[PDB]
Swiss-Prot record, chains A, B:
Binding site for heme c 2: 42, 53, 58-59
GO CC entries: periplasmic space
Protein name per its UniProtKB record: Cytochrome c3, 26 kDa
A Gene Ontology molecular function term of the record: electron transfer activity
Statement: the UniProt record of this protein carries the keyword Iron: yes
Residues binding heme c 1, per UniProt: 29, 37, 40-41
Main localization, broad class: periplasm
Miscellaneous comment as given in the Swiss-Prot or TrEMBL entry: The second heme binding site has an unusual CXXXXCH motif.
Species of provenance: Desulfomicrobium norvegicum (strain DSM 1741 / NCIMB 8310)
Function: Participates in sulfate respiration coupled with phosphorylation by transferring electrons from the enzyme dehydrogenase to ferredoxin.
Family matches, as Gene3D superfamilies: Cytochrome C3 (3.90.10.10)
PROSITE patterns noted in UniProt: MULTIHEME_CYTC
Entry cofactors: heme c
Swiss-Prot/TrEMBL keywords: Electron transport, Heme, Iron, Metal-binding, Periplasm, Sulfate respiration, Transport
Length: 110, 110
């Protein structure tokens, strides 16, 4: 019943009439499997479900860019090293050479 | 879509014509929420799903008691401190006073 999707295409195309600045992002669970599911899916105890980070009421704000609900801040902030995409990748580099990408065109596929 | 059940009643009544020796076990995720989901649900990478520990092909052997698929060994072995029920509870005690139960009548409800 509960199936985990290996490859997920995260896209801003879901926002009404937003003209995206970057391409879609492909997230693979395989490369992140050693990380506790709840570290990223940090709201599991609040809803007892695992849902999209961009669900209504979560990180779905495409208007503001510096708010907690903002898409840009959420996935690129370097002040959070546990669940921010670039935040953790950035943090790994402080521990030694890391392949985890910071380049915009590594996450954002074209 | 993906909802996590808080209270799960684990029962051996699901085994053909097995006469159970002990009562059903109630497992609550709330008391175990700090533990990585995949530590217990250790076969997630093999099936990419989270299913019952007693699923066919897993720990469903009620005939043998000392085999890996055996129900008795799986949940009570003290040689595994990561996913065995009594194994971890036992291990916690070596770290200091722990309320985590070892008494048969704590897990097995009556
Ligand atoms: C741990 C093995 C783990 C589980 C379990 C898990 C499940 C999961 C599901 C069911 C989805 C789909 C949600 C939906 O219906 O939209 C999902 C999606 C994503 N996950 Fe995950 N996930 C686990 C682990 C991890 C880890 C360790 C991270 C962080 C590196 C993570 C992140 C993500 C992301 C991102 C998605 C896409 C979410 C979106 O907004 O579309 N998962 N996960
Ligand atoms: C999806 C797996 C997901 C990610 C990724 C994610 C990241 C994230 C970050 C980086 C923060 C920190 C922001 C900061 O600058 O400090 C953060 C904070 C909150 N999130 Fe989140 N988040 C993901 C999923 C979800 C979901 C599904 C919701 C909505 C229920 C949501 C909500 C929030 C809230 C609220 C916060 C602030 C409070 C807190 O727990 O720190 N997030 N998220
Ligand atoms: C945020 C949802 C997020 C994204 C998106 C993301 C992407 C990503 C890519 C594209 C790679 C390269 C490999 C691949 O294509 O899968 C990659 C690899 C690693 N990541 Fe990541 N990642 C996201 C989030 C996080 C978080 C929150 C962490 C850390 C807690 C993290 C870690 C890693 C690691 C480790 C790798 C492997 C790098 C390597 O040495 O090969 N990612 N991520
Ligand atoms: C490189 C500095 C970089 C830029 C620039 C960038 C931009 C960007 C924007 C503007 C968005 C919002 C949606 C849009 O396309 O307009 C966005 C969203 C996501 N990003 Fe990004 N991004 C940059 C870098 C990275 C890196 C290195 C990763 C992966 C670690 C990454 C991930 C994400 C994710 C996840 C999202 C949300 C889903 C989406 O809208 O595509 N970005 N990024
Ligand atoms: C981490 C927050 C986490 C998730 C996610 C999770 C999910 C989950 C589901 C969906 C079930 C139902 C499976 C089914 O359909 O039968 C389930 C059931 C049990 N879980 Fe769990 N679980 C998470 C965390 C943990 C942890 C940390 C443990 C170990 C202490 C654990 C164990 C169990 C057990 C036992 C069950 C009942 C399984 C059965 O055989 O009936 N879960 N979990
Ligand atoms: C359900 C969350 C679940 C539990 C609990 C569990 C425990 C468990 C233990 C204690 C062991 C160690 C046995 C020993 O004495 O060394 C163990 C080993 C295996 N398991 Fe398991 N297991 C749970 C779930 C599942 C599921 C859903 C399956 C079937 C796909 C399964 C299978 C196995 C197998 C095979 C092993 C041996 C190989 C290994 O990974 O160590 N388990 N399990
Ligand atoms: C194996 C599937 C398993 C069961 C069953 C189980 C039950 C259980 C009970 C009945 C309690 C008491 C509280 C309650 O009713 O929920 C309890 C509490 C703790 N457990 Fe446990 N537990 C199972 C598995 C595991 C595993 C694998 C670990 C360790 C990795 C673990 C840990 C804990 C902890 C910690 C507690 C809290 C004790 C406290 O100080 O209150 N359990 N468990
Ligand atoms: C105390 C030493 C103790 C006994 C005895 C005991 C017995 C027992 C049996 C015989 C089974 C198999 C099914 C049956 O009832 O015949 C079984 C299964 C489970 N047990 Fe147990 N058990 C004892 C202790 C404990 C403790 C302290 C816990 C919780 C940490 C626990 C847990 C479980 C679980 C889970 C199962 C599987 C589901 C089920 O069949 O009930 N047991 N136990």
């Amino acid at each position: 019943t509960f199936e985990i999707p290996e490859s997920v295409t995260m896209s801003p195309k879901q926002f009404e009439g937003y003209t995206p600045k970057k391409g879609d992002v492909t997230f693979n669970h395989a490369s992140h499997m050693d990380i506790a599911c709840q570290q990223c899916h940090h709201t599991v105890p609040d809803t007892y479900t695992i849902e999209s980070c961009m669900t209504e009421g979560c990180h779905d704000n495409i208007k503001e860019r510096t708010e907690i609900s903002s898409v840009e801040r959420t996935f690129h902030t370097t002040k959070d090293s546990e669940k921010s995409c670039v935040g953790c990748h950035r943090e790994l580099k402080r521990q030694g050479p890391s392949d985890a990408p910071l380049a915009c065109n590594s996450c954002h596929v074209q």
